[PDB]
Design a protein around this motif. Sequence first.
Motif, PDB file in Angstrom:
ATOM      1  N   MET F   1      25.766  69.743  37.542  1.00  0.00           N
ATOM      2  CA  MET F   1      26.039  69.217  38.908  1.00  0.00           C
ATOM      3  C   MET F   1      26.888  70.235  39.665  1.00  0.00           C
ATOM      4  O   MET F   1      28.025  70.471  39.238  1.00  0.00           O
ATOM      5  N   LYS F   2      26.359  70.815  40.739  1.00  0.00           N
ATOM      6  CA  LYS F   2      27.067  71.857  41.518  1.00  0.00           C
ATOM      7  C   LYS F   2      27.765  71.217  42.712  1.00  0.00           C
ATOM      8  O   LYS F   2      27.177  70.300  43.283  1.00  0.00           O
ATOM      9  N   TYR F   3      28.972  71.662  43.053  1.00  0.00           N
ATOM     10  CA  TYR F   3      29.736  71.177  44.221  1.00  0.00           C
ATOM     11  C   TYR F   3      29.894  72.356  45.173  1.00  0.00           C
ATOM     12  O   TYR F   3      30.761  73.191  44.909  1.00  0.00           O
ATOM     13  N   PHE F   4      29.092  72.433  46.235  1.00  0.00           N
ATOM     14  CA  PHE F   4      29.206  73.507  47.247  1.00  0.00           C
ATOM     15  C   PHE F   4      30.144  73.049  48.361  1.00  0.00           C
ATOM     16  O   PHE F   4      30.006  71.939  48.819  1.00  0.00           O
ATOM     17  N   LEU F   5      31.047  73.901  48.818  1.00  0.00           N
ATOM     18  CA  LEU F   5      31.990  73.573  49.914  1.00  0.00           C
ATOM     19  C   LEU F   5      31.289  73.806  51.250  1.00  0.00           C
ATOM     20  O   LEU F   5      30.932  74.958  51.526  1.00  0.00           O
ATOM     21  N   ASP F   6      31.102  72.745  52.018  1.00  0.00           N
ATOM     22  CA  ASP F   6      30.477  72.821  53.351  1.00  0.00           C
ATOM     23  C   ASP F   6      31.560  73.237  54.340  1.00  0.00           C
ATOM     24  O   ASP F   6      32.033  72.364  55.078  1.00  0.00           O
ATOM     25  N   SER F   7      31.957  74.508  54.347  1.00  0.00           N
ATOM     26  CA  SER F   7      33.069  75.004  55.192  1.00  0.00           C
ATOM     27  C   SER F   7      32.870  76.479  55.521  1.00  0.00           C
ATOM     28  O   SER F   7      32.203  77.160  54.727  1.00  0.00           O
ATOM     29  N   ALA F   8      33.414  76.950  56.643  1.00  0.00           N
ATOM     30  CA  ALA F   8      33.367  78.371  57.045  1.00  0.00           C
ATOM     31  C   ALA F   8      34.803  78.897  57.081  1.00  0.00           C
ATOM     32  O   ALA F   8      35.006  79.999  57.610  1.00  0.00           O
ATOM     33  N   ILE F   9      35.766  78.132  56.564  1.00  0.00           N
ATOM     34  CA  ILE F   9      37.206  78.521  56.533  1.00  0.00           C
ATOM     35  C   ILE F   9      37.476  79.131  55.162  1.00  0.00           C
ATOM     36  O   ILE F   9      37.251  78.420  54.180  1.00  0.00           O
ATOM     37  N   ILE F 164      17.874  70.761  45.070  1.00  0.00           N
ATOM     38  CA  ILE F 164      18.155  69.853  46.215  1.00  0.00           C
ATOM     39  C   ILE F 164      19.648  69.889  46.526  1.00  0.00           C
ATOM     40  O   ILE F 164      20.437  69.629  45.613  1.00  0.00           O
ATOM     41  N   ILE F 165      20.029  70.172  47.770  1.00  0.00           N
ATOM     42  CA  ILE F 165      21.456  70.157  48.198  1.00  0.00           C
ATOM     43  C   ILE F 165      21.647  68.987  49.160  1.00  0.00           C
ATOM     44  O   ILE F 165      21.429  69.180  50.359  1.00  0.00           O
ATOM     45  N   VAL F 166      22.038  67.818  48.655  1.00  0.00           N
ATOM     46  CA  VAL F 166      22.318  66.637  49.517  1.00  0.00           C
ATOM     47  C   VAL F 166      23.420  67.071  50.482  1.00  0.00           C
ATOM     48  O   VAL F 166      24.456  67.500  49.983  1.00  0.00           O
ATOM     49  N   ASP F 177      26.298  58.583  44.663  1.00  0.00           N
ATOM     50  CA  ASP F 177      24.886  58.195  44.945  1.00  0.00           C
ATOM     51  C   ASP F 177      23.985  59.400  44.642  1.00  0.00           C
ATOM     52  O   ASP F 177      22.974  59.206  44.004  1.00  0.00           O
ATOM     53  N   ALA F 178      24.397  60.622  45.026  1.00  0.00           N
ATOM     54  CA  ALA F 178      23.583  61.839  44.835  1.00  0.00           C
ATOM     55  C   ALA F 178      23.527  62.157  43.345  1.00  0.00           C
ATOM     56  O   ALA F 178      22.452  62.508  42.879  1.00  0.00           O
ATOM     57  N   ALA F 179      24.636  62.001  42.625  1.00  0.00           N
ATOM     58  CA  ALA F 179      24.714  62.278  41.178  1.00  0.00           C
ATOM     59  C   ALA F 179      23.886  61.245  40.417  1.00  0.00           C
ATOM     60  O   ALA F 179      23.238  61.626  39.436  1.00  0.00           O
ATOM     61  N   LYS F 180      23.913  59.987  40.845  1.00  0.00           N
ATOM     62  CA  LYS F 180      23.149  58.896  40.192  1.00  0.00           C
ATOM     63  C   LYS F 180      21.656  59.146  40.412  1.00  0.00           C
ATOM     64  O   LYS F 180      20.873  58.737  39.548  1.00  0.00           O
ATOM     65  N   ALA F 181      21.280  59.787  41.515  1.00  0.00           N
ATOM     66  CA  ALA F 181      19.870  60.089  41.839  1.00  0.00           C
ATOM     67  C   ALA F 181      19.405  61.253  40.970  1.00  0.00           C
ATOM     68  O   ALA F 181      18.283  61.202  40.489  1.00  0.00           O
ATOM     69  N   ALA F 183      20.380  64.592  42.031  1.00  0.00           N
ATOM     70  CA  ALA F 183      20.425  65.772  42.920  1.00  0.00           C
ATOM     71  C   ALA F 183      21.108  66.926  42.191  1.00  0.00           C
ATOM     72  O   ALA F 183      22.063  66.667  41.446  1.00  0.00           O
ATOM     73  N   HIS F 184      20.645  68.149  42.436  1.00  0.00           N
ATOM     74  CA  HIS F 184      21.152  69.360  41.755  1.00  0.00           C
ATOM     75  C   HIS F 184      22.528  69.702  42.300  1.00  0.00           C
ATOM     76  O   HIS F 184      23.434  69.855  41.488  1.00  0.00           O
ATOM     77  N   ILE F 185      22.661  69.811  43.617  1.00  0.00           N
ATOM     78  CA  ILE F 185      23.935  70.216  44.270  1.00  0.00           C
ATOM     79  C   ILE F 185      24.318  69.172  45.312  1.00  0.00           C
ATOM     80  O   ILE F 185      23.427  68.447  45.760  1.00  0.00           O
ATOM     81  N   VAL F 186      25.595  69.084  45.655  1.00  0.00           N
ATOM     82  CA  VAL F 186      26.078  68.207  46.752  1.00  0.00           C
ATOM     83  C   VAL F 186      27.005  69.098  47.567  1.00  0.00           C
ATOM     84  O   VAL F 186      27.887  69.685  46.955  1.00  0.00           O
ATOM     85  N   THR F 187      26.778  69.238  48.866  1.00  0.00           N
ATOM     86  CA  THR F 187      27.660  70.036  49.753  1.00  0.00           C
ATOM     87  C   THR F 187      28.542  69.072  50.543  1.00  0.00           C
ATOM     88  O   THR F 187      27.987  68.142  51.145  1.00  0.00           O
TER      89      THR F 187
END
Lengths: 217, 217, 217, 217, 217, 217, 217, 217
Positions: F1-9, F164-166, F177-181, F183-187
């Motif tokens: 399970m990958k955790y991508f940071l949805d940020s530009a900071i 898939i990146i939810v 919900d994304a982990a239970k489905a 999904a590969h990554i969650v941003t």
Amino acid sequence: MKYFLDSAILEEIRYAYENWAIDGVTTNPRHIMNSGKPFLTVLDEFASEFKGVENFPISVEINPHLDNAKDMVEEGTKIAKLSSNFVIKIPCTEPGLIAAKEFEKQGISTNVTLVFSPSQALQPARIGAKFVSPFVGWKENSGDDTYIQDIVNIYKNYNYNTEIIVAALRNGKQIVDAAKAGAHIVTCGFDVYKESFQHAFTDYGLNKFRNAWDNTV
Amino acid sequence: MKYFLDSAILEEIRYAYENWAIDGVTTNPRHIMNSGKPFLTVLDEFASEFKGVENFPISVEINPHLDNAKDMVEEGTKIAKLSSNFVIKIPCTEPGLIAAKEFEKQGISTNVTLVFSPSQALQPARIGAKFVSPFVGWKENSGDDTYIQDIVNIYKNYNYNTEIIVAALRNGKQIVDAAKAGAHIVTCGFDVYKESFQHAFTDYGLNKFRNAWDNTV
Amino acid sequence: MKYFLDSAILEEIRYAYENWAIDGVTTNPRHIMNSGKPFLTVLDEFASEFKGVENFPISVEINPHLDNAKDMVEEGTKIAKLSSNFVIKIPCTEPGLIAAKEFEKQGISTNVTLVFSPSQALQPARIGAKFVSPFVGWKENSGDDTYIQDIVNIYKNYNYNTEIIVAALRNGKQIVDAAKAGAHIVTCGFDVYKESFQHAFTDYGLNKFRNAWDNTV
Amino acid sequence: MKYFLDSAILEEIRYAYENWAIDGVTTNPRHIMNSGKPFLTVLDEFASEFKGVENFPISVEINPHLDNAKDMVEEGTKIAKLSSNFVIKIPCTEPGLIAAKEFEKQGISTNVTLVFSPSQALQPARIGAKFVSPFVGWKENSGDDTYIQDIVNIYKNYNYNTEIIVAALRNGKQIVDAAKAGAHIVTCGFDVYKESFQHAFTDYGLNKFRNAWDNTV
Amino acid sequence: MKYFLDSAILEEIRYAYENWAIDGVTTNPRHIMNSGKPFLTVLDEFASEFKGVENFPISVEINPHLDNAKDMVEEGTKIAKLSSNFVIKIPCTEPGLIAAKEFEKQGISTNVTLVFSPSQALQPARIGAKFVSPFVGWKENSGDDTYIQDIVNIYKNYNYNTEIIVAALRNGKQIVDAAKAGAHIVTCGFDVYKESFQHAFTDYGLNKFRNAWDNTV
Amino acid sequence: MKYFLDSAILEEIRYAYENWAIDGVTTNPRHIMNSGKPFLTVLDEFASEFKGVENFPISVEINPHLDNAKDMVEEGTKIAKLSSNFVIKIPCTEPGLIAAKEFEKQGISTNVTLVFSPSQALQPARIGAKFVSPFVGWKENSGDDTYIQDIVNIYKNYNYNTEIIVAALRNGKQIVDAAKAGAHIVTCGFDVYKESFQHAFTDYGLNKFRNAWDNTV
Amino acid sequence: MKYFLDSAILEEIRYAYENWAIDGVTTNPRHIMNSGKPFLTVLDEFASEFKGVENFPISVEINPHLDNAKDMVEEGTKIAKLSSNFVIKIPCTEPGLIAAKEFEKQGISTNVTLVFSPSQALQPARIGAKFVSPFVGWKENSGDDTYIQDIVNIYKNYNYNTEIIVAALRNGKQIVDAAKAGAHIVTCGFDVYKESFQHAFTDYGLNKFRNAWDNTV
Amino acid sequence: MKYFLDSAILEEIRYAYENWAIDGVTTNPRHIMNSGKPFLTVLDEFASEFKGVENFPISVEINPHLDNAKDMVEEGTKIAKLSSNFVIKIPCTEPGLIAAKEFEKQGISTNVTLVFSPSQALQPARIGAKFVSPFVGWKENSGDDTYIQDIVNIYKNYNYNTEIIVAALRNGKQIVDAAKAGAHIVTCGFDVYKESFQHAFTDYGLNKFRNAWDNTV
Ligand SMILES: *[C@H](CO)[C@H](O)[C@H](O)[C@@H](O)CS(=O)(=O)O
Ligand SMILES: *[C@H](CO)[C@H](O)[C@H](O)[C@@H](O)CS(=O)(=O)O
Ligand SMILES: *[C@H](CO)[C@H](O)[C@H](O)[C@@H](O)CS(=O)(=O)O
Ligand SMILES: *[C@H](CO)[C@H](O)[C@H](O)[C@@H](O)CS(=O)(=O)O
Ligand SMILES: *[C@H](CO)[C@H](O)[C@H](O)[C@@H](O)CS(=O)(=O)O
Ligand SMILES: *[C@H](CO)[C@H](O)[C@H](O)[C@@H](O)CS(=O)(=O)O
Ligand SMILES: *[C@H](CO)[C@H](O)[C@H](O)[C@@H](O)CS(=O)(=O)O
Ligand SMILES: *[C@H](CO)[C@H](O)[C@H](O)[C@@H](O)CS(=O)(=O)O
């Protein structure tokens, strides 16, 4: 799927073994009382009847008054020395589960009986009991529904080798329920097994086929 | 299926290890307070009792006042140097998850405790925590239903090695719920385990079997 | 939805009545033993405390050694003559259900207790028992799931007036389960009710709201 | 289905009342802090804005530091005397539920807030609270699923008059979830309500219909 | 169950009214463009065709470029003055929902169209819109599943009088889906309704019955 | 399970990488606008910060005004030449899917973003896109339920390598919900991840454990 | 997951092959009629367009008036000799299934079309048909629900190699339904595929991202 | 999936074998009576017709008046010596299951027929019967639902080699039900198989395709 005969009568054990291919025999202090023969006599007969027969487990319950795991291990060691087919049946009690762990460590096969919950079934499995007998009929007689699927699922999820013997079965629909769950063995009386093999629609079709055969050259 | 004794009393840890085959022991600052002995004393006794015993994890929580991941890693390194069976128990906090990642990188086994959601359980798994303890009883006492199946399913779907220790268990039905979910370990007090092995219908059958044995030669 | 206090302590019965609006009080021989006062004393205090209070049922169990429905009807008639708020609690036994039918015919309210199946609950309902107490905690302690919804549904389908008192409740989630089923009353100890009214997220929000109030004129 | 504006800003309360037909307004110590005006000022403005307006509830939380049910009843009595539209908001605590029962007995409408379980929601209903606010967003932010349907079902099964105000709503899908459950009221910020009324497919169709209108006499 | 003809062609509106018993007619700027006649002409014809006909709603969309609720109320008031059968169709936008509330307050029936979520459908219902048109086909063309049951259930749970007109229907199975949900009206093109009344198995049976009739005196 | 940071900071990207073990970073034209730095500057910093770091994908969206697949392939080729960690983010449009197929054929990793249906997700998978970002939050803000499980199931059934990146996640329950489905990554933004690691019951237990530690030697 | 273009127009077959990566082309007597070119001409063009292309199946239906399996095998042998990409499409009739078995025995790939039940789909699979085309749209137009999952499950349970081509698809949601079922191929018209790749929320986000890009250096 | 022809007519057995690829033939005393030929004649014809054909089982029922397992084994041994394709069909009776066990031990393939419960099906499987025929039609004619899935699931769970032949099938939907369950073989009359291959929508499409072909060069 194993069918063990829940009987202490050797006329029914002999018939079921030669015609129904029973895979084992389970007995309880009440089945031996109904035998009309003394306990040691029933055991001697069972030991000789299946002297050479291999893979034919014969579950035999120790003194039900035994309250100490040390007294149970001494009594069940003696009974187990009477035949290699004998499997010591021990009640799911504190001293029974302690006695079943010592027995299994000495290589004496044990059948932890009188289990009425999946929590009482898990400990027998953690100590390497050869068999665990979850009872169905008794709870039903008192208006309770019958946790059998839970035990099968738990045993499977944790790769346990303990074989589940659904006991107190009274009809072939309860045999169907145990088979649908995935239970390893089902122990039933001779009459429960005979009626389970019969259906009214088989007698109906037989009459329709007997009428046709007659109206044919 | 592992049964860890949630106790800091060595009379109950010794009994459960020799009779119930417990696979480990979990403790919290409240179990050590109820021990009546000083923390370091309880640790010395646990270290000697299981000096050689291998594969017997002994979860020990660090100072609960620790607020920095650096102070937690210094305190838990000292406790971990007292025995190879000791597993540092760290709360699921920002600095606890930062301290649990540093600990796991240095090869010190960690048990991220006080997890009450599947989102709080996933981070411990992403940092390679040896154990994650999701609590059940507390949430139930406040009228909440108990996410345990979600954690088991997530851990399995993403092939995580972290072992789930369902904690705050109060009855054998909650042990059945954890086993039905697929939880790796269940931590419970000595009395929760004893009662889980007992049933009224086992005492009923025992009386029926004791009456039969008596009416038999 | 009625909340009966499962206690024989009048400091907890007085508090719960004035602050939680309890609708009744249930007691068992073990609650009276833990009271530390003699049975007749506890009864005299309960009779005076709620002398005038109407619609405040006080369930009081008769001698648990009583084995005849005639001896139970004589003992429960005496206890019932001590206060109009007293409801004779009788065990779900052959002679208890025979004694509960005679009591209800004489106009003495009865609470058929120790019911652990929906079949044991239906007979109390057929004889016009005022209350039927299905126990939950005990079965759970022995790894059994808890038939409560079945009793509620049966009672409703056949328009029975008997009110169901879910007993042996140990947490507020089991109160939620009884309320979700449609049970009429839930009997719980003082501490089960206090904790059921509390939540950690209420203390979290309270701290967030206390910080805001402070940063405000 | 009532839509209460969770705001302490009177520019948003005035707009939502004249264009969206809001049925009430809920405020918390954090909404008053974000107002930038002193608490008593916000109250005076709200009291005059809706002086005559009837059936427009304005939930106002008392001092969050209040720890005694007597101090809460004295503070909330003063706030309630400022306008007939004001509904005293009290936290779901032991002294809050004791203070909400005294308030409701004196005829002061109360909104038991910070409820995060169906067990914490049932007591407010048993004491005749006018409103009970179960929070959703907070539990979700901590990875918890959101018991809302249970409260609606319990309230309905036991014919309770308390109106449920689903709070901490952050999107129109959570408004759909509360409406699908049967919640009486939903409290949301001005922006949650605006976006809930908008959809991309409405702008797509509008462009298709604007192209057609143009290619038509 | 009402069947409205989604058409601006009076040859199809006349046929469906005399043979299929249509209960109303819905039009959009694209149906009027495909008519080939100017908008005002289509309206004059529809006004005369159903001059006396009562209970025959004729939904007519106002200028799709209108961006202010004041400009929409002025344009829709003029169109509504052309016939008592005309129902002003307004898009589910901020200014459309503000204009639909003013219209409904002046007694002008409104059909809030272009609704693609149950949250966009609830506001039209709170302001007393006569009709709400949830679109299905568009979302399906973009691979989305079609919230129709949610709107029906919400409308019913809160006793709303707004009638739901499932729109953008393309086949008789989507008519079956709307009827199974409980939608009040379904708007479809003339060809969707004709094919919905036909089946291949009706032509098969007709051939089998035509062969039998021939082989019969 | 990958955790991508949805940020530009880069202060939040640096922290999350060293303390939370983020596995990647996703950015959109709105995150770069909120950065306050010019686009090319943000890129230069991201390129140097992770110069050597391998397996750290940095999704960067090309000019959103690009309407031709040829102009997108020329702009995204230039951006991709700035760092080997950069993954060109392309909108799910006709020319975006044509440009994503050409990019993937030249070996430039692409993240087909703005996907709101499982039909829009399947084409990106058929052309070998490295990532597909299905958005959740936006649809929820407009009262729509969130097809995520369908995409995971379709991807799995047809053995697609696209990860898939939810996206548009706003709370830790949507991470659950994304982990239970599956999904590969969650941003998610930095604050969504911090709060997801925290729970009120962790602070409650911490206080109970801090009181015990104090009442202990 | 294969996407076959259900078209006989080579401008749409050429585009879909170069931009959408179609995996094949299916045609029926109605698609060739709408082509405007003679049947043999359409075939010559298709044969040259994909002369070398391998793994590009081109389903071509034989004379629909053919009533004998011998006449079908003679006509389909001639058509199959025109190109190695051609797959003879035969109707699911007695003589079609007899002709499809002879064809498959001679090594001519066959697509048994016009299948509207899972019983009509199983025989094509038992005779080794290369493709079986279950139709959806037609049954839906007549108000029938669409057995597609049953065929996929049966094919899988019995390890059949026949590939299922869900036909008569009219929207991308029906493409999602076929993919969720596990269908091998989906045949759709050029416009069904284009719209399936588009969403209104993609145009909404694109506008939000185009506004941000502009307000950024 | 095997399709056995339930017929004793060799014109229908020859056709189905050459055109439908039947995998076997089942007969009962009523099918031989309807043949009009003597039993031994039907057998001689079946033996010569498939003299060399391998893997073509021909189930032949023995005298239905046979009541002893010894008389059944003598009669079925004679019939089995007439052809290697013949499989002795024995009724599910006590003496039939005893005779089927002896037959299977001597290497004579047996088809235990007239099975109407999953309990009657399990014994045939425990004795190594080659085939077990569970009947459906008869039970349905008497208003009973048709345990077929249970037998398939039990057979699979216990890895039984016995092949299930769902019998008394009357329509192609019951063929679909057996295939959806996972039954190995389905035995049906010639007309049940012909109609199962036909559909009205195939004749509808054929007419639409025949009209198009005509309006095409
Ligand atoms: C042993 C369990 O393995 C016994 O045979 C068991 O008691 C029961 O199966 C039967 S009964 O209630 O005594 O009929
Ligand atoms: C450690 C978790 O692994 C502890 O032993 C835990 O606190 C709880 O299990 C128990 S209790 O609430 O303190 O009873
Ligand atoms: C009466 C039932 O109506 C009693 O109060 C009951 O025994 C139990 O509720 C409680 S406990 O197990 O003794 O706690
Ligand atoms: C009152 C409940 O009725 C408040 O307005 C509540 O706190 C919350 O709804 C909102 S938030 O978390 O402060 O946004
Ligand atoms: C009005 C809604 O009540 C219209 O007639 C609607 O636009 C659609 O139903 C049809 S279509 O997409 O234009 O076919
Ligand atoms: C890229 C997708 O992979 C972006 O980062 C995405 O836009 C959204 O995740 C976030 S938000 O709506 O802008 O918050
Ligand atoms: C062939 C099946 O493989 C055809 O192309 C089929 O007829 C239908 O898919 C389409 S339509 O109804 O003619 O549109
Ligand atoms: C044999 C079973 O394997 C027979 O052929 C069977 O009787 C029935 O299938 C048919 S019917 O009821 O006689 O039609």
